[PDB]
Amino acid sequence: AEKVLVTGGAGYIGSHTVLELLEAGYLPVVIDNFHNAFRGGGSLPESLRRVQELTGRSVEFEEMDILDQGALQRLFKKYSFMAVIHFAGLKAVGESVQKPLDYYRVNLTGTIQLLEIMKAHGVKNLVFSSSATVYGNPQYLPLDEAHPTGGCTNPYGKSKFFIEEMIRDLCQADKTWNAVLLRYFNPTGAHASGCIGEDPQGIPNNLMPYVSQVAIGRREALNVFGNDYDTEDGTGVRDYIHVVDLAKGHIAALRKLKEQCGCRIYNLGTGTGYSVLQMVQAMEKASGKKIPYKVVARREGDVAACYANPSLAQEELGWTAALGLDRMCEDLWRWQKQNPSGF
Amino acid sequence: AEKVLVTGGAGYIGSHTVLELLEAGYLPVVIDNFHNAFRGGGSLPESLRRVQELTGRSVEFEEMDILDQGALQRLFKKYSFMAVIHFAGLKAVGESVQKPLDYYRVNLTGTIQLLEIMKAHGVKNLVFSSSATVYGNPQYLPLDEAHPTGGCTNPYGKSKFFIEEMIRDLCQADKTWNAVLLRYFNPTGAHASGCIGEDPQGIPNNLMPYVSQVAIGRREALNVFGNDYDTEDGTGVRDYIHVVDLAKGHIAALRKLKEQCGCRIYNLGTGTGYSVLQMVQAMEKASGKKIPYKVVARREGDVAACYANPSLAQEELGWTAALGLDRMCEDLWRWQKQNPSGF
Numbered sequence: 001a002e003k004v005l006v007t008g009g010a011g012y013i014g015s016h017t018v019l020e021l022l023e024a025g026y027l028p029v030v031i032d033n034f035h036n037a038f039r040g041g042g043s044l045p046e047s048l049r050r051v052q053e054l055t056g057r058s059v060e061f062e063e064m065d066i067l068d069q070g071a072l073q074r075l076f077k078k079y080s081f082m083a084v085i086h087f088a089g090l091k092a093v094g095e096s097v098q099k100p101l102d103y104y105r106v107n108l109t110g111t112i113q114l115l116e117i118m119k120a121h122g123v124k125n126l127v128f129s130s131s132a133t134v135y136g137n138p139q140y141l142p143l144d145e146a147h148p149t150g151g152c153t154n155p156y157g158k159s160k161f162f163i164e165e166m167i168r169d170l171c172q173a174d175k176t177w178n179a180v181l182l183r184y185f186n187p188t189g190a191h192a193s194g195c196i197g198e199d200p201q202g203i204p205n206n207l208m209p210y211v212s213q214v215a216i217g218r219r220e221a222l223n224v225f226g227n228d229y230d231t232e233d234g235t236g237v238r239d240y241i242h243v244v245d246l247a248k249g250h251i252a253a254l255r256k257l258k259e260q261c262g263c264r265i266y267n268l269g270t271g272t273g274y275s276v277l278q279m280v281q282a283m284e285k286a287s288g289k290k291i292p293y294k295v296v297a298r299r300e301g302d303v304a305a306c307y308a309n310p311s312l313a314q315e316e317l318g319w320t321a322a323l324g325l326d327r328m329c330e331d332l333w334r335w336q337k338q339n340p341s342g343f
Numbered sequence: 344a345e346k347v348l349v350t351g352g353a354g355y356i357g358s359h360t361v362l363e364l365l366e367a368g369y370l371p372v373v374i375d376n377f378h379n380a381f382r383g384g385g386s387l388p389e390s391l392r393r394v395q396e397l398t399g400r401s402v403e404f405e406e407m408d409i410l411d412q413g414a415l416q417r418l419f420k421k422y423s424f425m426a427v428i429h430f431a432g433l434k435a436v437g438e439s440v441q442k443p444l445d446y447y448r449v450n451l452t453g454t455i456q457l458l459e460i461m462k463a464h465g466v467k468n469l470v471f472s473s474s475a476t477v478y479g480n481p482q483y484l485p486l487d488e489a490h491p492t493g494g495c496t497n498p499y500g501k502s503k504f505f506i507e508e509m510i511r512d513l514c515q516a517d518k519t520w521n522a523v524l525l526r527y528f529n530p531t532g533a534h535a536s537g538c539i540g541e542d543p544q545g546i547p548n549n550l551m552p553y554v555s556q557v558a559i560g561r562r563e564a565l566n567v568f569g570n571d572y573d574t575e576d577g578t579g580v581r582d583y584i585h586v587v588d589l590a591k592g593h594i595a596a597l598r599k600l601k602e603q604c605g606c607r608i609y610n611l612g613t614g615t616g617y618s619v620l621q622m623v624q625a626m627e628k629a630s631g632k633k634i635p636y637k638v639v640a641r642r643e644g645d646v647a648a649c650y651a652n653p654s655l656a657q658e659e660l661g662w663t664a665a666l667g668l669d670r671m672c673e674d675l676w677r678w679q680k681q682n683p684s685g686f
């Protein structure tokens with residue numbers, strides 16, 4: 001009878017997490033304003049319509065904006081939530097630099113309003129979908145939870161760090177609160193059905209969607225930003241986690257809340273980084289297609305390598321990533337091939 | 344003609360700044376929600392009614408909350424502002440620890456909404472009243488504008504740092520913006536008339552109100568947290584600026600905006616810290632009263648000395664603080680004697 005609110009649940013990570021919630025026997029209620037999700041032929045976002053088909057279970061959904069205080073108040077009176085998993089936000093790094101106020105409005109004001117209504121209704125159990133960009137430029141590797149946070153170099157990253165700090169302070173002030181902050185890097189891959197996945201609008205900003213678009217013929221060549229890094233092959237080494245593993249980590253965090261854990265922070269990841277060229281090669285193998293690329297200048301603010309240590313999650317969340325590079329690529333490619341234009 | 348919006352202009356630093364604006368020939372419009380200011384017998388806050396009397400000039404005033412987007416929209420259509428000086432916020436360091444969400448809501452969401460409406464109306468000139476607590480615990484002294492920021496532990500400090508970062512990012516994204524961030528420590532004293540000053544606060548940020556209250560006989564003794572610090576007399580050395588000098592610094596910042604300066608950051612202060620015992624002594628002299636004190640243990644997290652270097656402001660704002668510790672004490676005492684319960 002108690003429900004789990006999932007904000008931004010129509011999106012890439014959200015929709016995968018809704019599916020995992022349903023399969024694990026929880027009752028999700030999703031809100032989304034369709035900022036970055038596709039509308040289906042019915043009331044549901046297309047992603048969540050397919051989730052219903054994939055699971056045989058229904059998703060309760062309300063189209064609303066977390067910036068709408070009155071809608072939030074109504075939502076919290078209407079449903080009895082035992083916890084909230086918070087994905088609603090803006091997440092494009094390049095757009096954040098250009099439009100910082102939008103990022104701070106949606107991410108900060110949105111989160112503060114959510115926390116306020118949660119507090120008002122005594123829902124004091126939160127999984128926050130954070131970002132390992134909060135660690136800033138790596139001072140050692142792999143990044144663990146003891147590594148410094150802050151000194152991010154873009155508004156997106158700062159907004160994530162600021163939210164973490166607000167949550168930490170809330171939990172300090174009220175020990176009844178339980179919150180799990182999950183830090184990870186690049187979600188990749190798709191549900192094994194190939195029926196849902198990441199559906200970028202326009203030219204993709206992340207590597208893997210771009211590479212899949214090259215493979216499918218929609219793009220000519222991948223731009224590789226620098227090949228003179230202090231890495232094995234010269235290209236940037238980055239951290240890629242299968243979205244299904246990531247979604248399962250959000251479930252493990254939800255369960256951790258039941259232990260009355262207070263404020264906890266965990267990295268989610270495989271513990272192994274891959275270079276740009278390693279991902280291209282893996283996508284060529286998965287796709288059976290040539291993926292042309294062109295080396296261009298380093299991108300402002302990029303470092304040689306960043307990857308996370310997931311040992312703490314393994315020990316305290318009972319969680320490990322099961323899906324490796326080839327699976328990420330195979331699952332991405334299936335989504336791409338089955339859905340050449342996305343939703 | 345063009346006006347200067349002063350948010351939180353009914354409060355202590357705000358009201359003094361309004362008077363300085365009037366004396367310098369600007370046209371102020373104040374907004375305040377009376378969260379921490381006293382209502383007068385007419386439409387104006389008592390502070391601003393007395394400012395009118397002091398200057399012989401009128402202050403326009405609207406009672407509204409910076410959290411109210413619709414009220415902000417109406418305000419910016421109603422008046423034509425050339426610039427905004429932003430004091431509206433919560434500012435009790437001790438209260439922030441107990442109620443962090445309120446600090447983040449008012450300070451962050453309030454500022455974001457202000458910046459958004461400013462952008463929407465092409466008002467791109469801001470003086471932000473910041474806090475030198477953004478430097479965190481001193482790594483060297485005196486603190487200058489090159490010193491690291493962030494690493495504040497209290498929510499108030501963090502909120503101020505986060506606002507600075509949002510403003511910096513806004514100005515990075517739009518070079519047409521001009522903003523001056525003013526960092527200072529503890530305002531004290533009062534207008535020389537003795538007719539305005541700081542009202543009794545719930546949770547003061549500094550010892551001066553307590554010392555004045557001991558001298559007036561409202562309190563028995565001052566608690567001195569430690570007398571074994573690495574300082575000349577063993578008591579903690581802290582940074583105090585006369586509120587009139589502070590207010591004049593906000594005017595200097597306003598003028599700097601005309602230079603199309605972009606984002607600029609200046610410390611304001613006298614350049615010399617004062618110990619607890621020096622303040623006691625100075626208030627004894629000013630008051631002609633004995634001020635008993637009791638040395639108690641150090642407060643966890645307190646440092647021996649913390650004060651700001653104001654050289655950059657002299658060089659680039661043409662501004663110096665002229666009023667010293669004795670004057671701060673004399674002016675505080677006059678306000679206290681003329682107005683034992685504030686307004």
Ligand SMILES: NC(=O)c1ccc[n+]([C@@H]2O[C@H](COP(=O)([O-])OP(=O)(O)OC[C@H]3O[C@@H](n4cnc5c(N)ncnc54)[C@H](O)[C@@H]3O)[C@@H](O)[C@H]2O)c1
Pocket residue numbers: 007008009010011012013014031032033034035036037064065066067086087088089090091106110129130131132160184185186187
């Ligand atoms: N994609 C990544 O690489 C990545 C990495 C680290 C962290 N994250 C975090 O995950 C979350 C985003 O998830 P995603 O990658 O699935 O992106 P996404 O854009 O696919 O999903 C976010 C969802 O939030 C919705 N939304 C946005 N603003 C909203 C608002 N004001 N009210 C209601 N709904 C709103 C969008 O419509 C979208 O459906 C954010 O918290 C982001 O910081 C993403």
Ligand SMILES: NC(=O)c1ccc[n+]([C@@H]2O[C@H](COP(=O)([O-])OP(=O)(O)OC[C@H]3O[C@@H](n4cnc5c(N)ncnc54)[C@H](O)[C@@H]3O)[C@@H](O)[C@H]2O)c1
Pocket residue numbers: 350351352353354355356357374375376377378379380407408409410429430431432433434449453472473474475503527528529530548
């Ligand atoms: N007093 C200090 O020790 C100190 C030190 C450094 C910086 N500052 C900064 O100075 C400003 C506060 O000035 P002050 O010390 O004169 O305090 P104050 O409380 O006297 O003034 C702040 C004013 O803002 C008003 N206000 C609060 N919330 C508001 C809201 N939501 N909408 C509209 N009005 C609102 C209050 O009613 C008050 O009149 C803040 O920006 C604070 O961070 C103060």
Ligand SMILES: CCNC(=O)Nc1cc(C)on1
Pocket residue numbers: 204205206207208210222223224225226235236237238276302
């Ligand atoms: C989508 C555009 N291409 C890339 O993401 N290329 C990259 C990423 C990194 C790192 O280096 N080149």
Ligand SMILES: CCNC(=O)Nc1cc(C)on1
Pocket residue numbers: 549550553565566567568569578579580581619645
């Ligand atoms: C509560 C009033 N007393 C003080 O503020 N005392 C102090 C302040 C510092 C510093 O050391 N003692």
Ligand SMILES: [Cl-]
Pocket residue numbers: 024025026
């Ligand atoms: Cl369950």
